[PDB]
Amino acid sequence: SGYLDDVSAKFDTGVDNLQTQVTEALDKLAAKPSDPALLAAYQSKLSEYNLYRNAQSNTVKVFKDIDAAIIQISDAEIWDMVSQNISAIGDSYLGVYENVVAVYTDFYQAFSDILSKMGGWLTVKLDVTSLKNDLNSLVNKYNQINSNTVLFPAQSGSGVKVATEAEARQWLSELNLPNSCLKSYGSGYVVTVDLTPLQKMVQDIDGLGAPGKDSKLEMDNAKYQAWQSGFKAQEENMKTTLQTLTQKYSNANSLYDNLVKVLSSTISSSLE
């Protein structure tokens, strides 16, 4: 509607420009595959690319509300109306991340609670059978599809909300999670927490050997230290995963804010 048309172009151009920067960033990374910073730059670009496409696909809904709000002018005021009239985008981007981190945190806490009773299960003798029972139970619980396991889509209330495969795969790639996290359900797909560390744990407990009468298992210090270390390392992986999702969320907040600045500056210039 008049000045909105300009804003629509800005998204198109932005989407085009980003599509190119995602490629440029992927190349730079290819040349130095193990660089932490190059990987994040590439991924930020992808996240940003997905964000503009998101906005692009919500053009109709968003422009409608913004136009209304407009039909009633400070730059700060423009920025504010844009800020409260783009939930279509906000809820499907930041809302998702908010949910990803909330769910992964609860998942990690559930694990922490299990660690709490390790001493109670301890050459050395470890209550192998009972520790593995809690781990295996944790796995089966978080290996289901419900509001305690799903990262994307956000599960709003009672029932199970799914997405198309491409949508879920896009979030799978943005969160950089393994394929084991992608699950089918009903008409679509969902992204759930990574259980690989837990499964590796119970798996390694099995490698300690069959227990005895106590159903427990005693082992010399060498064998125990190596087990305790491999175990702690798996816990660290889950901790690392939680932290990377948190950092991606924080990065997303900044990309979202920048998009709002662009959107606002355009609308402003268009009204002049």
Residue numbers in the entry: 6 to 77, 129 to 178, 186 to 335
Q: Which text from the study accompanies this structure?
A:
Bacterial infections including Salmonellosis and Shigellosis affect millions of people every year. These bacteria use a T3SS to secrete virulence factors to manipulate host cells. The T3SS is a multi-component system that forms a continuous protein transport channel through the two bacterial membranes and the periplasmatic space that extends into the surrounding medium by a needle structure. Tip proteins, which bind to the distal end of the T3SS needle, are thought to play an important role in this process. SipD from S. typhimurium, IpaD from Shigella flexneri and BipD from Burkholderia mallei are tip proteins that are thought to interact with their corresponding needle subunits PrgI, MxiH and BsaL, respectively, to make the needle tip complex.
Here, we address the questions of how the Salmonella SipD interacts with PrgI and deoxycholate and the mechanistic consequences of the assembly of the T3SS needle tip complex. We could show that two different proteins, structurally conserved in many pathogenic bacteria, bind each other to constitute the needle tip of the transport system. Bile salts influence the T3SS of intestinal bacteria. For instance, the presence of deoxycholate either impedes (S. typhimurium) or facilitates (S. flexneri) host invasion. Noteworthy, it was recently shown that SipD and IpaD bind deoxycholate and some of its derivatives.
